[PDB]
Point group: C3
């Protein structure tokens, strides 16, 4: 069913909307052309998350998928949200470290595959097949995290200390936060229903707010976004 978890959806909606408003206000007085790019990328993340959480709260972002001999509530809007927000987050990191175009395309492509296959897995009717998609999606995520942890760090070391240190924090946060998603998916009602949809939703909400507002706070409050 899709009703008890409504509270986490409303809180999520509220936190994304507030985070968006905050980034918007904070970015009005900025003139630095570089920081300006960071504000545009980072402000869009929670703006999108706001619309997606609201769709889940209202019901539009919820669908029913049969599997395991039953109709299961699946929040497809979670994926529509991630489809656009994760590439943006990747872009933030890429700009901070001045990543090559080829590597950015590789990451965005891997990221689209990660979310796309995750969504296919969420809407798959054959229970067993859902885990095949989960595995492929997780493999794509690991590829991304690998490149971000090893490739970008080396790139970050060529920057001034402020950029390098802020990237390190965002990098660590990213590896931990992102890795948590496939685990929650696996234990929740979408994979092995070890935890109820109610707790599943709360966990994804905490993760999303941390990734779509927390990440942005750390970045936009640092001096690293200023090119100088």
């Amino acid at each position: 069913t899709g009703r008890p978890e409504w509270i986490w959806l409303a809180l999520g909606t509220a936190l994304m909307g507030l985070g968006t408003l905050y980034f918007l206000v904070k970015g009005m007085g900025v003139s630095d052309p570089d920081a300006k790019k960071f504000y545009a990328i980072t402000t869009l993340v929670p703006a999108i998350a706001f619309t997606m959480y609201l769709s889940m709260l209202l019901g539009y972002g919820l669908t029913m998928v049969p599997f395991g001999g039953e109709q299961n509530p699946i929040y497809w809007a979670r994926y529509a949200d991630w489809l656009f927000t994760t590439p943006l987050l990747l872009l933030d990191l890429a700009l901070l470290v001045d990543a090559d175009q080829g590597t950015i395309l590789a990451l965005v492509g891997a990221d689209g595959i990660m979310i796309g296959t995750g969504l296919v897995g969420a809407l798959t009717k054959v229970y067993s097949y859902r885990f095949v998609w989960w595995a492929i999606s997780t493999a794509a995520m690991l590829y991304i995290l690998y490149v971000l942890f090893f490739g970008f760090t080396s790139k970050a070391e060529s920057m001034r200390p402020e950029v390098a240190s802020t990237f390190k924090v965002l990098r660590n946060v990213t590896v931990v936060l992102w890795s948590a998603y496939p685990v929650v998916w696996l234990i929740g009602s979408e994979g092995a229903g070890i935890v109820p949809l109610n707790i599943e939703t709360l966990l994804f909400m905490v993760l999303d707010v941390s990734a779509k507002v927390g990440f942005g706070l750390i970045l936009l409050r640092s001096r690293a976004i200023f090119g100088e």
Copy 2:
């Protein structure tokens, strides 16, 4: 029902196809690398609109959405059309004024949110919820128009007189034309059915032709597209 308004859909389809053919022919003899970008962006707009209007005329682009205790005809293809055409129009304006990358991303993102939420609103089954989406979409549009009217104009003033004057005309046309969409939506069968689907369709057709052919005519017939 979806039959009486067929005439506006056929006229729309014909006007978009002709506008596409015209821009195509007109752009063949162009060598200026800058003008060339304007032709590619501007010619794609009605080409896309052509396929979308044709889908609406044939029926593919029409769906039924229950709300208000009835099954209502909703032309989702109108939105699929706008999803790709509005960002292109924004790109035309951006190139004309040499807008920063961060501002272009902000606009395109706001634009995707505008159309995306508008579509969610059009497919929402709870009558009352439809207006919440309309409001969010309108807020995103106002953000875009604000940046285009104030931000781009200042940017346009740094260009030669021909570019500045052509931008001013396109700017004024854009603010007036775009603002008309949420009003038509609000009075039509998608919001408060004050006007029938028949007139609703005709109004959107006039607006679309003006925006996807009229805008292009003003731009491609001006010398502003030449960088020199």
Copy 3:
């Protein structure tokens, strides 16, 4: 029905996965910033094709479309695959010849129209209307092939012999391979069912493997990807 052709879907899935793994391994030791872009673009093509063929094999990528007085199996995942892979292939060619941004946008836009209308045609319930979409899609393809054969070749001649010769081979392969798709569509169960779904699927599989692995082999094994 969607069962006998399963073998071509499994072979396709296997070949795309292997081609992806091969490109991945082959690209690990590359440092040339230019070649690196080619590897990212080219490796993503079969990675995407892998997920799409797997969805068709598992059943997710298969839908039923009524027309001709019957429910017909339609592999929509074929189109979802092409939607992302063809623009990438176009990008490979564009980078090899250093095509202008306006021409790249024109091609990608024409390409999205080509696949999008092809998909609309595949999901159209009115038999006769399916061919209208096929014609529009084919017209867009011809536009693309025209620009690739005449426009890019001239651009390729300004490059060193290795780039020019490799482009010529990729160009010829592209014109022949791509042109084959609308023909297979036309003779298969999606258009005039002259050939059964079983052979239709096998033919598209041979074409896809040739285009998503064969094309990449020719490119990534050449010295043309090195800018120097």
